[PDB]
């Protein structure tokens, strides 16, 4: 049984996800507009910034 934590109402489903460095919620990297080639050391979601 999978989890939904990202703001697009869609579950993990094997998709890479990054943690909100502040609120802790897990955001799909695609939704966070993050390329696998450049990944922030600290990430902040829309709610927390
Ligand atoms: Zn997502």
Numbering used by the authors: 337 to 385
What text appears in the publication on this structure?
To better understand the mechanism by which PHF23PHD recognizes the histone tail, we determined the protein structure. Although PHF23PHD was crystallized in the presence of H3K4me3 peptide, unexpectedly we obtained the structure in which the N-terminal sequence of one PHF23PHD molecule was bound to the second PHF23PHD molecule. Alignment of this structure with the structures of other PHD fingers, such as of KDM5A and BPTF in complex with H3K4me3 peptides (see discussion below), revealed that the N-terminal sequence DLIT (residues 338–341 of PHF23PHD) and a preceding serine derived from the vector superimpose very well with H3K4me3 in the KDM5A and BPTF complexes. Much like H3K4me3, the SDLIT sequence is bound in an extended conformation and pairs with the β1 strand of PHF23PHD, which results in the formation of the three-stranded antiparallel β-sheet. The I340 side chain occupies the aromatic/hydrophobic cage of PHF23PHD consisting of F348, M353, and W362 with another hydrophobic residue, L339 being positioned to make an additional wall of the cage. Mapping the most perturbed residues of the protein (due to binding of H3K4me3) on the surface of PHF23PHD confirmed that H3K4me3 occupies the same binding pocket of PHF23PHD as the SDLIT sequence. Of note, I340 in the SDLIT sequence superimposes well with the hydrophobic part of the K4me3 side chain, further suggesting that lysine mimetics could also occupy the aromatic cage. Substitution of either M353 with valine or W362 with alanine abolished the interaction with H3K4me3, and replacement of F348 with alanine led to protein unfolding, suggesting a role of this residue in structural stability of PHF23PHD.
In the NUP98–PHF23 chimera, the amino-terminal portion of NUP98 with multiple GLFG repeats is fused to the carboxy-terminal portion of PHF23 that contains a single PHD finger (PHF23PHD). In this study, we report molecular mechanisms for the recognition of methylated histone H3K4 by the PHD finger of PHF23 and inhibition of this interaction by small molecule compounds DS and amiodarone (AD). In contrast, H3K4me1 and H3K4me0 peptides induced CSP in PHF23PHD in fast exchange regime, and plotting these resonance changes against peptide concentration yielded Kds of 580 μM and 1.6 mM, respectively. These results suggest that PHF23PHD selects for the higher methylation state of H3K4 (tri- and dimethylated) and discriminates against monomethylated (H3K4me1) or unmodified H3. Collectively, our data indicate an overall similar mode of action for these NUP98 fusions during AML development that depends on binding of their PHD fingers to H3K4me3, a mark enriched at promoters of actively transcribed genes.
